[PDB]
Amino acid sequence: GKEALRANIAAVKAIEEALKSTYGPRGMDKMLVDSLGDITITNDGATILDKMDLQHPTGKLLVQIAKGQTADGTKTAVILAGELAKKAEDLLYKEIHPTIIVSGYKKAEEIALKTIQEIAQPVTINDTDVLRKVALTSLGSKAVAGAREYLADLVVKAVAQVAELRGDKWYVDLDNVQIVKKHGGSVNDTQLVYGIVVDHPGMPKRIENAKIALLDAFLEEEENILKEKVDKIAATGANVVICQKGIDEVAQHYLAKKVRRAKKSDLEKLARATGGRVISNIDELTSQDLGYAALVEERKVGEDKMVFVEGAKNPKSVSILIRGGLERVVDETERALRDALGTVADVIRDGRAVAGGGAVEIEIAKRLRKYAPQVGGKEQLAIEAYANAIEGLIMILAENAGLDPIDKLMQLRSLHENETNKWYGLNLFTGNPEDMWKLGVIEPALVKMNAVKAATEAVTLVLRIDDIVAAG
Amino acid sequence: GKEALRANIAAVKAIEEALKSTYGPRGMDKMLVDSLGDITITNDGATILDKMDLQHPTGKLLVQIAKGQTADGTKTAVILAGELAKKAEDLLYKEIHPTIIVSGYKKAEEIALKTIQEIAQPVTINDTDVLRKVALTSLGSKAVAGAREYLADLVVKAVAQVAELRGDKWYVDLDNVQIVKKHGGSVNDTQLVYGIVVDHPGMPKRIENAKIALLDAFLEEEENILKEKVDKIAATGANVVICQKGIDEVAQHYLAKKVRRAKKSDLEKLARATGGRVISNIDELTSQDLGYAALVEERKVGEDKMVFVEGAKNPKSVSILIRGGLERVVDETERALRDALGTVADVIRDGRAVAGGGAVEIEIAKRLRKYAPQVGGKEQLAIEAYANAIEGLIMILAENAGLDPIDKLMQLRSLHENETNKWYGLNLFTGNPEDMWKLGVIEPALVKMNAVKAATEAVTLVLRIDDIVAAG
Amino acid sequence: DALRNNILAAKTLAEMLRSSLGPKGLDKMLIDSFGDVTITNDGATIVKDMEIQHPAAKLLVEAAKAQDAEVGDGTTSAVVLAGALLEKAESLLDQNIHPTIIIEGYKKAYNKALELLPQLGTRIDIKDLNSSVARDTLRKIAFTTLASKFIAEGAELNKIIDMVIDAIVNVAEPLPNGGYNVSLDLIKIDKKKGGSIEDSVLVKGLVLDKEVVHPGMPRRVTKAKIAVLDAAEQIKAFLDEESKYLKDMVDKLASIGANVVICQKGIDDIAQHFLAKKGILAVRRVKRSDIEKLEKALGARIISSIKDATPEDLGYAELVEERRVGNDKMVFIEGAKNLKAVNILLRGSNDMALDEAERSINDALHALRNILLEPVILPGGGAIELELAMKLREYARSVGGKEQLAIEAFADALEEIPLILAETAGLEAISSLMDLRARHAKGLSNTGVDVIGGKIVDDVYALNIIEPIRVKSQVLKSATEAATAILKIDDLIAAAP
Amino acid sequence: DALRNNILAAKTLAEMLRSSLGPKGLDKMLIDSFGDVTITNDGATIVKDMEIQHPAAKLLVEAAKAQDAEVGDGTTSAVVLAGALLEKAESLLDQNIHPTIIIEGYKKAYNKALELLPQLGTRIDIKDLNSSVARDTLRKIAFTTLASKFIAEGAELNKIIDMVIDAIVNVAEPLPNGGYNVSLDLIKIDKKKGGSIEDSVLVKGLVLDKEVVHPGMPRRVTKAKIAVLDAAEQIKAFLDEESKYLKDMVDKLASIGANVVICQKGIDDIAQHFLAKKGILAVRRVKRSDIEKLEKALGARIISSIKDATPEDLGYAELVEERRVGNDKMVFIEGAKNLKAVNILLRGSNDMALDEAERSINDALHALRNILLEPVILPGGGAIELELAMKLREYARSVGGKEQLAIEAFADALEEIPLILAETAGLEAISSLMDLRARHAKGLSNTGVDVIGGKIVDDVYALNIIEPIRVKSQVLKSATEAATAILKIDDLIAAAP
Ligand SMILES: Nc1ncnc2c1ncn2[C@@H]1O[C@H](COP(=O)(O)OP(=O)(O)O)[C@@H](O)[C@H]1O
Ligand SMILES: Nc1ncnc2c1ncn2[C@@H]1O[C@H](COP(=O)(O)OP(=O)(O)O)[C@@H](O)[C@H]1O
């Protein structure tokens, strides 16, 4: 059923083309258009793939795959899978059975992962320059309005807190990072807080050693019931009370005499940080479900009130306030910062880093070409094709910078004949090849490995499927 | 270039379809239509292929091949080639390279010829019943108006004369047989003459020990020249004078005081029989170029004058007068008689005969199936296909008789498991399988061999050609 | 014409599952119309969940579903075959051979093949595991099923096979055919998270608990077990006897004559010491779902109150042992009362390897069950099909009429399995078949196709490629029935509900 | 775009001759527009006689015609290659690589290959036929050319080869390259009807006559030959001396000092007896066309009249002998004056076998000439192409820029010859090539493809598959020139005659 396969390959190629030009540290932006008419301008690939109007099953699948295990790297996986698909197509026209191409690609994947594992430069949490570089790596091309060397600082400072070593590996519980945003000034007004932050005259403000009530949950009778509900909570010794559902202002008065938030993604991290737990029904509420916060308080953002939970019990607590002008700015800042956090977190947790600019890529290709003749006939071609498909990334990376792809590919290929140039990659601003390690173009080995892995998996899935059937 | 090959195969299949239903001793007739509007109704395949409106190069080629070395057998060759082409097509769809199919078919051809050589029953000129049977074989289905056992007599009597043994093999110089025709009565009025026959008060009639002048070739001046020309001939001692060009009646008067024929095909055999030779220019005429005819004469056909050259020197001289009603009758008689003469001549000259009814065919198939597994993989299939293509002839032969092909094929196949039924074939009138030898269904082995050979050659030629090109 | 349409329908359906055959069977993606998807190369799943269009195809689906119902292994093999039969039939229709003739031919061919299956079958030795003959067979078939689906290391696999063997020892047997009926209800697979696969272990039940008190008896030869629910107006008040109470409870338990006490609610140190003095094996608290399972086998009863207890509630087991399992001590119970199923402790280092091991054991068990039910093996890799084809041509020769062509056309269909099965391995669909024919007609019937290795094998038994007869015959049957039923239908008629 | 059209034109042309390559080269049917046809797998014939359509294709035809002009053997091989180069170029155009770059790359690759041809060439020994080294080589190459085109029995063939060898002994030599220049003008092939092929024989001239009189001398060691035109108002009348005349004529002939007399008009018994007395070798009458040929070599002159004759008209030959040739006595003349060509008496039992033998000898001679002109052989069957491809990739590595891809694309084209050449033998166009690469990169450069046998050979020299260097280099040259010239053309422009 070639007719069903070609459509899959076309879908993959379509998504590649969708995310292609976004790639690199000079990646152009895409303009997403909602059917409403509203729009979203962005560089980040994950966001695109999220808001993107997915058509094909294989497409939605591919997206589902590229996002699996770390926000970034998706870009790489997608484009790589696209290249592999195209080269697979080229191989298919030569009447080569898919089960051969798959096997070849698998071998190539193994050799690739060996290659990355071999090249990788071990790093530690102490090598902060590396962390900074890795942070700054993804931050390039984000169109963030400056403060890259400051946002990177915030990242490096952020990951440092959320880290504790039980044994050999620090348990960087990334999920403890709260992220909010507001307008005004610029991203220089961005700032960290140790505790979680959340965007009537009410209850008191500065609570020291605060117990925090975390709760997701004829008229006269209802009043009695509601007051009963409030008193129940009051009888547990709760300093500050948090909710998600709408609270009757009468209960606000009551409690004031004793916020409703909006999102549970905050209440989550609040429960994480404070040490308390959420309750579905206040009838079950106790005094141990209350979270401990050593110095809770509230502060004014230039245009708005904002809640601060400082002095949270848990050591691994952290939040960041984002600031800027337009929505696109603060959003791109958010997503970029997420990417940074991801990359750095993976660097820390894994403890290995490599050079960008496509050094690892041309190295992997270089290796594959050597290993290719050592196996059978038809597989060798698949492996070679795999290598080429990898080089495609360098080429596209060159394209997105306004450079001639082939020339730079050949240059790097020529340079990587020396053992001592295994870090050399493409300086896109300069235009010439350079040692990407000194320029702080560093990325987590785990990201590269995962990208390769997921792309391979995706393409093999594309090739393994012979036909598409409607079921029930 | 499959696109060019399929067209060839289609052409061959077209010609097969053209000659298909004419096959067998119950073969239907085809009606040929000239663009003038005139028509020709006939069973004989050669005649069809002659008068047929040939379209394709491969077609004209195939016809050119089937007619090469014996008028009949062409039928067999054509249809066989068609079957082989169809089965080749069936093999081609299985992605088998032509050079394999060709080789297979060649092997099959070799085994087939071995088979015919093995089965063949040696015969001699003395076994006249065989000669009669072989004569009668082709004569069946000719729609000749009776006298089959008499025309066969004439054939047997005819070939007997034209035969002399220098060594091991009698030199049956078939080209010494003159054939003419006239209307009136029926084919019972057909009759042989030892000498050649050709259709003013003039020169004398009964010339004993006749010398025959064979010659293919202001007004007063022309008269002088012509008279000079006549006198030149007169001065050589020529009893009877023959010409081809138009003779001035003045020269007829002259010579009368001392015919213009129409065809040189007669003058040829006249030159053959009389022992004399033709002269292009009478200026070169001598007395030795005159042919010796012991008792030349003329006789009246019921409606016309006719010339008889009886007592011709050469022992191997013979002619036949054909008689009947309509043109189709006398024509079919002529062609049929030619076929008979051919077959019998080949039987005599070769000295081997086999049974018709498709006995030899199912034998050959039977052999091929046994020999097939003894060679390689892809060739085996070609050989098997060859066998099937041969069986196709039996099937078509069954079709043309209004019988179920497959059943009779299976019957014969079942019967030919016994060594003692190697002659069994299909009795078309009876409808059941029978020993074809006792029923006088006998044919020359050489004919079968040649048919196989030419068909194989044709199909291989069809398969060897990849594309057709216009040259200069 | 309508017949030809039906034929095309069934054929076109079969064309899809042509690629999903054997080890290298390509995937098929099923779109659950609810807005969900599931992909697989499994015949059953595909044929089941897929919403088929044409009636004839639906009938083929029906045949396949029956084929699956009778036995699990072969389902696609039937459909591909049916398709092949119809495809070979439509060539005979062009020979102007009435369907009924083809049908009878196919019936005869089927009967002969069915007769020939055992003739070409290699019977095995099932006379005990003392001999290890069965093990070698079980090892071959194990690897037959396991090889296609495992990417795990062989050493890890060998242990799993060892377990399955150890399982089969215990499982029941029917006498009539000298075979074994593996009741899969007699096998448990407890998926324990944490630990390597080699740490996995088999035993007739175990609670996965450590000895409550080291002084406590960690091994009991002749055991006696008790199940305890409660941990050790008209007013009722407890008499002021705190420790004496506990001691008396333990003495009562000792008085009943028990050597093991598996408390539902857990045991306190004092009770532990008393039990340790009496030399009783104490066990920590266990789940209700666990204890409920235990009592019925153990022939015991969950005691609500020891004061009212009685030896009627006393269970028993042949042996109990605190055994080390990957540096994790666990209480093992052996051969107690109604042994029922053999319990596997499956130590998976990850949920993937866990479910993978479980899956492997399951498949292996099912296959081994299928071969054990009918103790005759057939040379897989398409060898037996080719053999049958040869024999069926030989048999076709001795039949006449149009049926000689119908049987021969049955043979030509069988040979599509070797053809397709090799093609999946990327081998040339043609040369492979003729090479096979050559090797086969001039050699052993065991010549076949190794799809994994992607090569033609002179003897597939040596490569541990084995197929049960129970499956094959059924596949043949349902396939024949299907192709028949398709060929037998003349045309369609508009009806009223 | 126009460039791409040209490329497609040349490419589409090359596609046709793709199949006509090598031994199993499929046929092409040429329709002579006059209402006639001629079919062949020959590049030269096809390319020549065919009326080509597109200009680019016409240019490719031009290149091919040049390729044929320089040397006869390889013509199609050039066209297929050119097509391959363009096809590999159009893939680089899609890489957005300007044509001129590709052109330079191809030029460099061509130069390097041209340099590598001799490096990978196996030079031979041509130092005399005394040694038989040359014979073994000549035998191998003989069989190389002969094997593809002969269906005749080997024993018959061996004699033909023996003849060709015996011919080559006599033929001239150029010194500079230590090679031999076989002037085909120094070979006659007289097609005698009647007799077996083994009866065929070689000699420096022979008249195919029997000894007129058995008493007459049938063998003369030191010979002297004469050519006689006439058989032995102002009024002139012959003197009444009948026999005395004849005797005196013969005595005059004997007086001149001749030992052989080949009369144009034939000799009478009296003259025969006189000649027999004098011990002169008499020969019957011969054709004018024959005698005219004889006299110029023999340095003699056709004597109109013996009375006026003179030793100036006396010829000479080293040896003359009445030899038996298939039970047919014939007068052989050896080593006379200007030996010029060696004369073959070709005894064909049939016109077919006759023309076949002639054809065989011709082809063998041409090929042997081509290899002898440049005494270095190359491993045929596509081996040398693969070797070059390996070396050219290795060489391409040490070049940078877009040209590294242009050279690599030159290599990928060469490998189309092994691919196509094997494909003609029905082998898989892909697996064969990778198998070759494997055998080649890891083994001898002589690994190639035996098309006749239809199999990949580890060493093609052992299978007597040999290719001259003189042909190969020229093919490479003209192919490169062609593909270049096509790639170099930007677009088309309307012009005025
Ligand atoms: N400063 C830089 N110089 C050269 N290459 C870079 C640089 N920064 C990133 N890259 C390259 O960009 C690729 C990742 O790009 P992309 O995924 O689009 O952005 P992000 O890294 O933010 O996810 C990597 O392959 C890496 O080699
Ligand atoms: N009396 C007969 N009974 C059975 N078959 C016959 C008979 N006569 C001829 N045939 C068959 O007819 C075929 C030749 O038919 P065809 O070429 O059409 O006529 P002809 O023999 O006149 O050329 C042979 O294969 C032969 O087996």
PDB file of C-alpha atoms in Angstrom, chain B residues 324-457:
ATOM      1  CA  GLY B 324     -15.344 -26.918 -60.798  1.00  0.00           C
ATOM      2  CA  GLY B 325     -18.140 -24.373 -60.635  1.00  0.00           C
ATOM      3  CA  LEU B 326     -17.594 -21.157 -58.693  1.00  0.00           C
ATOM      4  CA  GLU B 327     -14.256 -19.385 -58.273  1.00  0.00           C
ATOM      5  CA  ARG B 328     -14.061 -20.079 -54.541  1.00  0.00           C
ATOM      6  CA  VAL B 329     -14.282 -23.795 -55.302  1.00  0.00           C
ATOM      7  CA  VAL B 330     -11.493 -23.974 -57.877  1.00  0.00           C
ATOM      8  CA  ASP B 331      -9.351 -21.591 -55.820  1.00  0.00           C
ATOM      9  CA  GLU B 332      -9.786 -23.532 -52.581  1.00  0.00           C
ATOM     10  CA  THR B 333      -9.098 -26.632 -54.642  1.00  0.00           C
ATOM     11  CA  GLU B 334      -5.872 -25.115 -55.944  1.00  0.00           C
ATOM     12  CA  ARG B 335      -4.661 -23.973 -52.528  1.00  0.00           C
ATOM     13  CA  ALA B 336      -5.726 -27.226 -50.878  1.00  0.00           C
ATOM     14  CA  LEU B 337      -3.907 -29.212 -53.544  1.00  0.00           C
ATOM     15  CA  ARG B 338      -0.821 -27.067 -53.005  1.00  0.00           C
ATOM     16  CA  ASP B 339      -1.020 -27.832 -49.279  1.00  0.00           C
ATOM     17  CA  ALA B 340      -1.380 -31.545 -50.004  1.00  0.00           C
ATOM     18  CA  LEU B 341       1.551 -31.551 -52.423  1.00  0.00           C
ATOM     19  CA  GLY B 342       3.629 -29.738 -49.825  1.00  0.00           C
ATOM     20  CA  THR B 343       2.824 -32.054 -46.934  1.00  0.00           C
ATOM     21  CA  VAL B 344       3.287 -35.225 -48.993  1.00  0.00           C
ATOM     22  CA  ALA B 345       6.488 -33.893 -50.540  1.00  0.00           C
ATOM     23  CA  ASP B 346       7.877 -33.203 -47.075  1.00  0.00           C
ATOM     24  CA  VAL B 347       6.821 -36.666 -45.892  1.00  0.00           C
ATOM     25  CA  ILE B 348       8.686 -38.210 -48.815  1.00  0.00           C
ATOM     26  CA  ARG B 349      11.787 -36.024 -48.575  1.00  0.00           C
ATOM     27  CA  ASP B 350      12.000 -36.281 -44.782  1.00  0.00           C
ATOM     28  CA  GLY B 351      10.668 -39.802 -44.278  1.00  0.00           C
ATOM     29  CA  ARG B 352       8.897 -39.395 -40.937  1.00  0.00           C
ATOM     30  CA  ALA B 353       5.275 -38.858 -39.952  1.00  0.00           C
ATOM     31  CA  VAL B 354       3.263 -38.307 -36.771  1.00  0.00           C
ATOM     32  CA  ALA B 355      -0.372 -38.303 -35.671  1.00  0.00           C
ATOM     33  CA  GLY B 356      -2.475 -35.170 -35.741  1.00  0.00           C
ATOM     34  CA  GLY B 357      -5.315 -34.395 -33.354  1.00  0.00           C
ATOM     35  CA  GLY B 358      -2.769 -32.797 -31.046  1.00  0.00           C
ATOM     36  CA  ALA B 359      -1.140 -36.041 -29.958  1.00  0.00           C
ATOM     37  CA  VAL B 360       2.368 -34.767 -30.591  1.00  0.00           C
ATOM     38  CA  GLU B 361       1.408 -31.588 -28.762  1.00  0.00           C
ATOM     39  CA  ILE B 362       0.219 -33.174 -25.526  1.00  0.00           C
ATOM     40  CA  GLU B 363       3.232 -35.464 -25.780  1.00  0.00           C
ATOM     41  CA  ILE B 364       5.551 -32.480 -26.047  1.00  0.00           C
ATOM     42  CA  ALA B 365       3.812 -30.768 -23.128  1.00  0.00           C
ATOM     43  CA  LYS B 366       3.974 -34.011 -21.156  1.00  0.00           C
ATOM     44  CA  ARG B 367       7.723 -34.146 -21.816  1.00  0.00           C
ATOM     45  CA  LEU B 368       8.338 -30.470 -21.036  1.00  0.00           C
ATOM     46  CA  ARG B 369       6.620 -30.722 -17.661  1.00  0.00           C
ATOM     47  CA  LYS B 370       8.991 -33.587 -16.809  1.00  0.00           C
ATOM     48  CA  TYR B 371      12.081 -31.770 -18.071  1.00  0.00           C
ATOM     49  CA  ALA B 372      11.069 -28.427 -16.569  1.00  0.00           C
ATOM     50  CA  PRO B 373      12.023 -29.067 -12.930  1.00  0.00           C
ATOM     51  CA  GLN B 374      15.436 -30.317 -14.051  1.00  0.00           C
ATOM     52  CA  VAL B 375      16.581 -26.791 -14.911  1.00  0.00           C
ATOM     53  CA  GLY B 376      16.692 -23.535 -12.965  1.00  0.00           C
ATOM     54  CA  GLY B 377      13.884 -21.639 -11.301  1.00  0.00           C
ATOM     55  CA  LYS B 378      12.749 -18.890 -13.648  1.00  0.00           C
ATOM     56  CA  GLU B 379      13.423 -20.955 -16.765  1.00  0.00           C
ATOM     57  CA  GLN B 380      11.260 -23.788 -15.450  1.00  0.00           C
ATOM     58  CA  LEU B 381       8.266 -21.446 -15.465  1.00  0.00           C
ATOM     59  CA  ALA B 382       9.010 -20.410 -19.034  1.00  0.00           C
ATOM     60  CA  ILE B 383       9.212 -24.036 -20.111  1.00  0.00           C
ATOM     61  CA  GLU B 384       5.962 -24.880 -18.325  1.00  0.00           C
ATOM     62  CA  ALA B 385       4.389 -21.854 -19.992  1.00  0.00           C
ATOM     63  CA  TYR B 386       5.727 -23.163 -23.303  1.00  0.00           C
ATOM     64  CA  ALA B 387       3.993 -26.478 -22.676  1.00  0.00           C
ATOM     65  CA  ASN B 388       0.732 -24.717 -21.845  1.00  0.00           C
ATOM     66  CA  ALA B 389       1.082 -22.589 -24.971  1.00  0.00           C
ATOM     67  CA  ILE B 390       1.406 -25.813 -26.941  1.00  0.00           C
ATOM     68  CA  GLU B 391      -1.708 -27.267 -25.275  1.00  0.00           C
ATOM     69  CA  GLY B 392      -3.480 -24.086 -26.345  1.00  0.00           C
ATOM     70  CA  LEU B 393      -3.404 -25.516 -29.867  1.00  0.00           C
ATOM     71  CA  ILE B 394      -5.329 -28.610 -28.806  1.00  0.00           C
ATOM     72  CA  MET B 395      -7.767 -26.394 -26.963  1.00  0.00           C
ATOM     73  CA  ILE B 396      -8.348 -24.113 -29.968  1.00  0.00           C
ATOM     74  CA  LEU B 397      -8.616 -27.192 -32.147  1.00  0.00           C
ATOM     75  CA  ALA B 398     -11.351 -28.373 -29.801  1.00  0.00           C
ATOM     76  CA  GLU B 399     -13.021 -24.950 -29.923  1.00  0.00           C
ATOM     77  CA  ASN B 400     -13.186 -24.910 -33.727  1.00  0.00           C
ATOM     78  CA  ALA B 401     -15.046 -28.232 -33.641  1.00  0.00           C
ATOM     79  CA  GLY B 402     -17.759 -27.073 -31.241  1.00  0.00           C
ATOM     80  CA  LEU B 403     -16.355 -29.061 -28.306  1.00  0.00           C
ATOM     81  CA  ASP B 404     -15.423 -28.166 -24.727  1.00  0.00           C
ATOM     82  CA  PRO B 405     -11.669 -27.442 -24.813  1.00  0.00           C
ATOM     83  CA  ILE B 406     -10.610 -28.154 -21.239  1.00  0.00           C
ATOM     84  CA  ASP B 407     -12.477 -31.458 -20.912  1.00  0.00           C
ATOM     85  CA  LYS B 408     -10.895 -32.907 -24.016  1.00  0.00           C
ATOM     86  CA  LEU B 409      -7.500 -31.553 -23.033  1.00  0.00           C
ATOM     87  CA  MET B 410      -7.814 -33.261 -19.646  1.00  0.00           C
ATOM     88  CA  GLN B 411      -9.030 -36.433 -21.326  1.00  0.00           C
ATOM     89  CA  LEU B 412      -6.072 -36.573 -23.703  1.00  0.00           C
ATOM     90  CA  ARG B 413      -3.705 -35.646 -20.882  1.00  0.00           C
ATOM     91  CA  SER B 414      -5.111 -38.515 -18.849  1.00  0.00           C
ATOM     92  CA  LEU B 415      -4.846 -40.879 -21.793  1.00  0.00           C
ATOM     93  CA  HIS B 416      -1.266 -39.895 -22.572  1.00  0.00           C
ATOM     94  CA  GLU B 417      -0.101 -41.193 -19.210  1.00  0.00           C
ATOM     95  CA  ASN B 418       0.135 -44.540 -20.998  1.00  0.00           C
ATOM     96  CA  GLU B 419       3.102 -45.210 -23.245  1.00  0.00           C
ATOM     97  CA  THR B 420       0.683 -47.073 -25.495  1.00  0.00           C
ATOM     98  CA  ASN B 421      -1.517 -44.042 -26.234  1.00  0.00           C
ATOM     99  CA  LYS B 422       1.145 -41.768 -27.645  1.00  0.00           C
ATOM    100  CA  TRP B 423      -0.891 -41.465 -30.848  1.00  0.00           C
ATOM    101  CA  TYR B 424      -4.240 -40.677 -29.249  1.00  0.00           C
ATOM    102  CA  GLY B 425      -5.749 -37.396 -30.362  1.00  0.00           C
ATOM    103  CA  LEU B 426      -9.100 -35.685 -30.704  1.00  0.00           C
ATOM    104  CA  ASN B 427     -11.741 -36.982 -33.109  1.00  0.00           C
ATOM    105  CA  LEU B 428     -13.615 -33.766 -33.828  1.00  0.00           C
ATOM    106  CA  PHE B 429     -16.556 -35.267 -35.677  1.00  0.00           C
ATOM    107  CA  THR B 430     -17.016 -38.066 -33.155  1.00  0.00           C
ATOM    108  CA  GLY B 431     -16.254 -35.674 -30.330  1.00  0.00           C
ATOM    109  CA  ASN B 432     -14.241 -38.199 -28.338  1.00  0.00           C
ATOM    110  CA  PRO B 433     -10.508 -38.990 -28.063  1.00  0.00           C
ATOM    111  CA  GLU B 434      -9.232 -41.727 -30.389  1.00  0.00           C
ATOM    112  CA  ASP B 435      -6.020 -43.187 -31.793  1.00  0.00           C
ATOM    113  CA  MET B 436      -5.372 -40.716 -34.578  1.00  0.00           C
ATOM    114  CA  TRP B 437      -3.075 -43.041 -36.502  1.00  0.00           C
ATOM    115  CA  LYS B 438      -5.707 -45.611 -37.452  1.00  0.00           C
ATOM    116  CA  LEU B 439      -8.055 -42.835 -38.568  1.00  0.00           C
ATOM    117  CA  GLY B 440      -5.473 -41.646 -41.078  1.00  0.00           C
ATOM    118  CA  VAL B 441      -4.841 -38.387 -39.256  1.00  0.00           C
ATOM    119  CA  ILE B 442      -1.154 -38.315 -40.136  1.00  0.00           C
ATOM    120  CA  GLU B 443       1.161 -35.362 -40.776  1.00  0.00           C
ATOM    121  CA  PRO B 444       4.831 -34.858 -41.634  1.00  0.00           C
ATOM    122  CA  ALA B 445       7.116 -34.581 -38.605  1.00  0.00           C
ATOM    123  CA  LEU B 446       9.117 -31.969 -40.475  1.00  0.00           C
ATOM    124  CA  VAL B 447       6.048 -29.721 -40.665  1.00  0.00           C
ATOM    125  CA  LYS B 448       5.469 -29.898 -36.927  1.00  0.00           C
ATOM    126  CA  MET B 449       9.160 -29.338 -36.212  1.00  0.00           C
ATOM    127  CA  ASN B 450       9.278 -26.368 -38.577  1.00  0.00           C
ATOM    128  CA  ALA B 451       6.126 -24.863 -37.081  1.00  0.00           C
ATOM    129  CA  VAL B 452       7.593 -25.116 -33.575  1.00  0.00           C
ATOM    130  CA  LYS B 453      10.909 -23.748 -34.777  1.00  0.00           C
ATOM    131  CA  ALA B 454       9.438 -20.746 -36.617  1.00  0.00           C
ATOM    132  CA  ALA B 455       6.995 -19.922 -33.828  1.00  0.00           C
ATOM    133  CA  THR B 456       9.802 -20.019 -31.265  1.00  0.00           C
ATOM    134  CA  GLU B 457      11.968 -17.816 -33.487  1.00  0.00           C
TER     135      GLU B 457
END
